[PDB]
């Protein structure tokens, strides 16, 4: 755009890191000028610390305020653990079952199918395992994945493909292991 | 055994001279909610979240006010050193595997850019799309850059072509990202 006027950005990030549930909690207050962190409060440190020289005054000023220091030290309880307790049910405990489909496909424009695709979409959390079976026997060779894709709408998707030229009569099975189902989902495709 | 690490981030920023402010919560890379400064209200990323928790947007406004002040202070402290434009990478993807006549969403993912000011346009068959599109606020990154999602509902067809046009001060030219359904 023709607005060539200089831009000045100020970011403030409060990170609550939770380890083994609420066993270990760490608060990180980060002040960022443009794309550079200048000062931070680390609960494992207990006081403000300058990241760049630009933030040294603030670190000195804020450390002189004992009310602020005590409140920030207690923030691991009054802020991080509080919000964890409030949001655990729909975040940490969020379980969405994946929609699983199986279809034949091709690696390139070509007159035979050289791929068996298993699409696993719309699930949460991201941890998932996918196995292929030919006639009830697991095929571990020629399996290629697109990796874990985060859609930004609290869902994940992935493709898991089996490089094979399916033959008439064979029955392929995609198996999806995910914390949302007590038994792994199975989808069959009959060639 | 031990449970996986989870991180909740309260991410807020203020930008001059645009006078833009943002306040949002993030859980493991997903937005929980943000605060719309206009209308002064908490917008949950998933509406269902509003039935389990609440947040007073007024405080976010207060925080943004403080951020504005701090930005100005820092602006003078750095001898009015401006931010360096970082151009984004743009990826077009689909919500799910594409099937003809089966409704879907085209996602334009704008990534790794700063400042958080971008201009995104959808182009169906070359023509700009102005309604029915949706977007997210500017999402935080660990390298303090930004992410953004733009969404376009559509009926897949072999005849139609799509483009995401992204303009940013770090780009030499508007960035076009193409997408088509071919068999």
């Amino acid at each position: 755009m023709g607005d060539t006027r200089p831009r000045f950005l100020w970011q403030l990030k409060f990170e609550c890191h939770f380890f083994n549930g609420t066993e270990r909690v760490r608060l990180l207050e980060r002040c960022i000028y443009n794309q550079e962190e200048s000062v931070r409060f680390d609960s494992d440190v207990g006081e403000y610390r300058a990241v760049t020289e630009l933030g040294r005054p603030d670190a000195e000023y804020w450390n002189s305020q004992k009310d602020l220091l005590e409140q920030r030290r207690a923030a691991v309880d009054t802020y991080c653990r509080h919000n964890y307790g409030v949001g655990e049910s729909f975040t940490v405990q969020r379980r969405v079952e994946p929609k699983v489909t199986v279809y034949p496909s091709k690696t390139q424009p070509l007159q035979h199918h050289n791929l068996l695709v298993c699409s696993v979409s719309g699930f949460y959390p991201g941890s998932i395992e996918v196995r292929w079976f030919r006639n009830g026997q697991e095929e571990k060779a020629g399996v290629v994945s697109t990796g874990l894709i985060q859609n930004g709408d609290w869902t994940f998707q992935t493709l898991v493909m089996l490089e094979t030229v399916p033959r008439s009569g064979e029955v392929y099975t995609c198996q999806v292991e995910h914390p949302s189902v007590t038994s792994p989902l199975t989808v069959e495709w009959r060639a | 055994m031990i449970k996986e690490e989870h991180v909740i981030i309260q991410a807020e920023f203020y930008l001059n001279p645009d006078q833009s402010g943002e306040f949002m919560f993030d859980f493991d890379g997903d937005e929980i909610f943000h605060v719309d400064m206009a209308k002064k209200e908490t917008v949950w990323r998933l509406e269902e979240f509003g039935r389990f928790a609440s947040f007073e947007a007024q405080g976010a406004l207060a925080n943004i006010a403080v951020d504005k002040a701090n930005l100005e202070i820092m602006t003078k402290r750095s001898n009015y050193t401006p931010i360096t434009n970082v151009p984004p990478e743009v990826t077009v993807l689909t919500n799910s595997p594409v099937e003809l006549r089966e409704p879907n969403v085209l996602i334009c993912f704008i990534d790794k850019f700063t400042p958080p000011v971008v201009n995104v346009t959808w182009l169906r068959n070359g023509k700009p799309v102005t309604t029915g599109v949706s977007e997210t606020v500017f999402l935080p990154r660990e390298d303090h850059l930004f992410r953004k999602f733009h969404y376009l509902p559509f009926l897949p067809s072999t005849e139609d072509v799509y483009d995401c046009r992204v303009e940013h001060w770090g780009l030499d030219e508007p960035l076009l990202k193409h997408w088509e359904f071919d068999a």
Partner: peptide
């Protein structure tokens, strides 16, 4: 229940 925000502090000014 209510989600709490972390309160922002003002930086030191110039003189």
């Amino acid at each position: 229940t209510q989600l709490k925000r972390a309160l922002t502090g003002i930086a030191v000014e110039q003189d």
